Each structure stands twice: as C-alpha cells, then as structure tokens.
C-alpha cells in the first residue's frame, strides 16, 4: 500500500501544500524511519522517482544509505534535475536535509575517484540552499575539501574572499568539526595562491575555536599558522588571549619542532636554519610540510637583505653577499633584482662599480590615489559600523535580561 500512499500523500503535500503534514512526514522519516534500507524503493521507487522528483530528495538519502550504489549516473541525472528545474524560491523546503545529502553523496565516492566532478555542483547548491551571503554552512567545508583534493583553487575564490558571519544551525547537524575543517582546508587554498595574510587569518580563526578536546585539525592548523607567520613576518604572531587553554596545554608540547624552527629563524642565522631543517626532515615530511619550511628558508635571505637596507645607503655587491651569506656577488645581484621586480624592496643597481643603492621615497601623500585609498577604508569602516549597529539593534529584542537593572 506504500506506493499509492506515497502517490496520493505526495499529491497532498505538494499540490495542496499544507506545510504541517509535509514537515510531519519529513521529521517522521528523519534518521529513524529512514532505516531498514529503502522503503521497497528498488521496484516501487522506480515508479515514484518519475512522479514529481521534488519530495523524493529526502528519499535519495535512503537511496544513498546503501553503500556502493550500482548506478552513479542516477545521482547525476537527479542533481541536473534539481539544478535545471530550479524554481529558485521553494528550495527553502530542503534546508536541513540538503546539507546532509550533499555531504553523504560527496563523502562516499567523489572524494575517492573523481574529486573534480562535484566542484561546480556544490557551488551551485550553496547559493540556492543557504539564506544570506554572510552565513557559514557545513557544505562549505565539503566544497573546500573537494577543491583542495582536485587541485582547483580558482572556483572557490569568491566563496573565501567574502568574510563569513553567522552560522546556520542546521537543526543541530552542524558539528564543530565541520567548522574546523572549513577554516583549515580553505587556509591551504590561501597558501596555494601566495596570499599569506588571509591564510594566517584563517588559521588564527581555526585555532581560536573554543573546544576542550584535542583534534588533529587543530594541531595541523597551529603548525601551518606557525609556518605562515614565519614566512610572512619575521616572528610568530601572538595568538589572541581569548583562545581555549587546551592549545597551550596539549597542542604546544606535541608541535615542538616548529617552535624550535621559529627560534632558529628568529635568531637570524641562515646557515643554522638549513642544518636544523636537515636534522628534523622526517618530522616535516611526515606532516606533509615539504614546501613551506623551504619557503621560510628562502625568505630568511630576503629578510636579511631588507634589514641591510634598514642601515645602509649604498653597498657593494660583494659586501652584500658576505653579509647575507649569499656566497656570490652575482647571486646577490639576482636576488636583489628579483626582490625589486616583486616590489618588496626599493633599490637600484649600478653595474659600473657593482653597487646597489636604496631610494626609499616611494610615496609623498600628495596624489588623488591616497585619497581614493582613504575613501575605500572609510567605506569599509562605515559598512562595518552599519552592520554592527544592525546586529546590536537586533540583539536588544530578546527579553533574556534587563528586568530591574
């Protein structure tokens, strides 16, 4: 009787559109009535999939309850159905179960064999399932994982540049882990595009999550935060003091090689850094960090050269090579030329005497460009203030406190 039950009942919920009963069945299925395999959907569901293909999304869940589904193109067909026959505004019906459905579909086979297949599917799903462009959801972590595993960094850029504020409850299905992944995997993206500032910010946000339990994601985020702070700046940036105390009790002792690497970097001895890297090579290779510490070793020379510019005005190439231990005037000239091209330094090279001069007068604050920069900063600050005021005025509605005081 279940088949015609579904037929006429689904007619009611969709056509007649009583929200009470549709949510009633939806919650009745949930994670309890969705067990015992599909509801004879191998044969009965063959007729029901072609019925309306809108109430059947929860059903797909049970149709992905069985592992290693023999046909995978069926999921492709139905996802192209939801993307093509997308009305746009009734997608709010699938708000809670949708994220679980995408996580289940991607966490089974997509991450194993074809991590590029669902790159655009999740991007399409995010805009039409979550409410406001400032809202962090669980499927963000899944999409970031897909982009990281498929070596695709460009499509996920617009989904990371915008600062993400407020987190959807997902009816309690949004575990803390899904948060820690999003600010960790995405951080890797910002270490692949040579955007170290946003990578450091993402790692700092991941570290400061209040959680009294040791997780490997937190450890890896701490290690990468140390490495990125060593690359970008000459020292490890101090973490905000409001972070959980577990980081300073269990995370720090386990991540010990990175701290001594930071100490060796701060003592400013490029010769010793290479030896220290060689000594602890196995730890870095085990944690998959061959490609970040080497960047720190390379950037130590740039830091030393910049500190040289902080003191000298006109220096010989041989003298610079001796001071920065670059072992060669030609290599020092090449490094200075590369840094001039990159814009990190202000210098000129005179090859008549093999000399390098420093002209540190880039800006005079007398041009409309700085006016435009100040205007942009003003606009950002004003938008931030308006958002803060709106949030504060939204907060004051709740009667939680302020009774007699």
């Amino acid at each position: 009787s279940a088949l015609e039950q579904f037929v006429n009942s689904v007619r009611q919920l969709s056509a007649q559109g009583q929200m009470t009963q549709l949510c009633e069945l939806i919650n009745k299925s949930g994670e309890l009535l969705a067990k015992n395999l599909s509801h004879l959907d191998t044969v009965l569901g063959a007729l029901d999939v072609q019925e309306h293909s809108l109430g059947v999304l929860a059903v797909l869940f049970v149709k992905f309850s069985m592992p290693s589904v023999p046909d995978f193109e069926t999921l492709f067909s139905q996802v192209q159905l939801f993307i093509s026959t997308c009305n746009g505004e009734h997608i709010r019906y699938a708000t809670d179960t949708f994220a679980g459905l995408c996580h289940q579909l991607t966490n089974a086979l997509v991450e194993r064999k074809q991590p590029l297949r669902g790159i655009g599917i999740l991007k399409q799903a995010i805009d039409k399932m979550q409410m406001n462009t400032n809202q962090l959801t669980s499927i963000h972590a899944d999409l970031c994982q897909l982009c990281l595993l498929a070596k695709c960094f460009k499509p996920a850029l617009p989904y990371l540049d915008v600062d993400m504020m407020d987190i959807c409850k997902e009816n309690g299905a949004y575990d803390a882990k899904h948060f820690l992944c999003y600010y960790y995997y995405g951080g890797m993206i910002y270490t692949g595009l040579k955007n170290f500032e946003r990578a450091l910010y993402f790692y700092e946000q991941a570290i400061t999550t209040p959680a009294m339990a040791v997780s490997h994601i937190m450890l890896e985020s701490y290690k990468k935060y140390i490495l990125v702070s060593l690359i970008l700046l000459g020292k490890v940036q101090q973490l905000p003091k409001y972070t959980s105390q577990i980081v300073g009790r269990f995370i720090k002792p386990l991540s010990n090689a990175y701290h001594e690497l930071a100490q060796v970097y701060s003592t400013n001895n490029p010769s010793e850094l290479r030896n220290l890297v060689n000594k602890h090579s196995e730890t870095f290779t085990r944690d998959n960090n061959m490609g970040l510490v080497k960047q720190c070793l390379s950037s130590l020379y740039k830091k030393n050269i910049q500190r040289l510019t902080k003191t000298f005005l006109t220096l010989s190439l041989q003298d610079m090579a001796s001071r920065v231990q670059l072992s060669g005037p030609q290599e020092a000239e090449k490094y200075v030329l590369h840094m001039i091209e990159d814009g990190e330094i202000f210098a000129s090279i005179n090859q008549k005497d093999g000399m390098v001069s420093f002209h540190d007068n880039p800006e005079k604050y007398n041009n409309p460009a700085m006016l435009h920069n100040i205007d942009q900063e003003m606009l950002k600050c004003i938008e931030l203030d308006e958002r803060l005021k709106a949030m504060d005025q939204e907060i004051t509605v709740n009667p939680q406190f302020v009774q007699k005081s």
């Binding site: 074809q114 590029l116 297949r117 790159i119 655009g120 498929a150 070596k151 695709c152 960094f153 460009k154 499509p155 692949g192 595009l193 040579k194 030329l337 590369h338 001039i340 091209e341 210098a347 000129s348 090279i349 005179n350 090859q351 008549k352 001069s357 205007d375 003003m378 004003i382 203030d385």
Partner: protein
C-alpha cells in the same frame, strides 16, 4: 580584451564538462592562457591537475609546460629561446605572439626600473635581440647613454557627496 574573453570561455568549458575529460587542445589552450597572464601559481596547479594520459597524448602540452618551467626560473633568454624553439597547433598560435609581446614589455619595464647603468650585452640578453638593433631602437627612443664603454644607461623620466555621507554618518 580578447584574452579576458578567452579566459572566460575556457573557464566556462572547464567548470561544466558533461564528458568530464576535456580535449588535449582545450587543456593546452588553458595552460597557454595561464602562462600569458604571468600567473605562475594557477598555471602550475593546472599543469598538475592534468591526467597523465592527456599529457602523453600530445607534445604541444609538453612544449607549453617547458615554456612555463623556463619562465618560472626568470631566465629571460631561455624564455625567448623556448618561445620559438618548437612548433605548436593553430589554436595556440595567436596567443604566443601576444605572450612574447607581453614578456618584451615586462623586460623593458624591469630594465628601466631596476637598472641605472646596464651593460649593453645584458640589455641584449634581456630583450633577446642583437645588440646593434636594440642600440638603434633605444637611440631613437632616447633612454640610452653611449657606446665604447658598453654601458647603456636606462633612465625613467562627487567629493561633495562623499563628504556629506561621511559627516552624516559621523553625526549619528
């Protein structure tokens, strides 16, 4: 202009692939377009993304990757040599000339900004041209000093609305 349109076209092609595995010419065009915009990180990641079978299908991808490897090392004479050493397919021909023009402009700007006195041989290596041709050209342009010592000297010779918005916001 046309480069941005081609980038949008190839990004659209890659984003939605009903067949999943695109043609080797498409990937080669993508690699060349990434190379043109001197964005080495994206070009390297795209090169890594490529399945080995499509790499081994055609040697045009290998040539473009050799060009990318040479340009990653900032070896301008190597870039100039490898941009003309081999041959490629028709769809990538109208982009390699633009890439060579862009790299020539970049070399000229780098020489002008990062050098006050440069040896003429170094200038010729940077531009990948015979010394005399470059000398004559920069004589006509005028950014050069003299011969004999072999030292060319490259030198480089609604406010009301915004204010009222600021003050209106400030007044609360």
């Amino acid at each position: 202009f046309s480069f941005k349109k081609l980038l949008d076209q190839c990004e659209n092609q890659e984003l939605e692939a009903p067949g999943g595995i695109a043609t080797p010419p498409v990937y080669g065009q993508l690699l060349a377009l990434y190379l043109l915009h001197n964005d080495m990180n994206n070009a390297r990641y795209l090169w890594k993304r490529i399945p080995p079978a499509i790499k081994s299908a055609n040697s045009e991808l290998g040539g473009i990757w050799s060009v990318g490897q040479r340009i990653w090392q900032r070896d301008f004479p190597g870039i100039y040599t490898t941009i003309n050493a081999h041959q490629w397919s028709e769809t990538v021909q109208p982009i390699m000339e633009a890439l060579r023009d862009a790299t020539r402009r970049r070399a000229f700007a780098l020489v002008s900004q990062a050098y006050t006195s440069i040896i003429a041989d170094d200038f010729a290596a940077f531009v990948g041209l015979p010394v005399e041709e470059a000398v004559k050209g920069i004589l006509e342009q005028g950014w050069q000093a003299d011969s004999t010592t072999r030292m060319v000297l490259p030198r480089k010779p609604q406010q009301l609305a915004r204010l009222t918005d600021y003050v209106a916001f400030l007044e609360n």
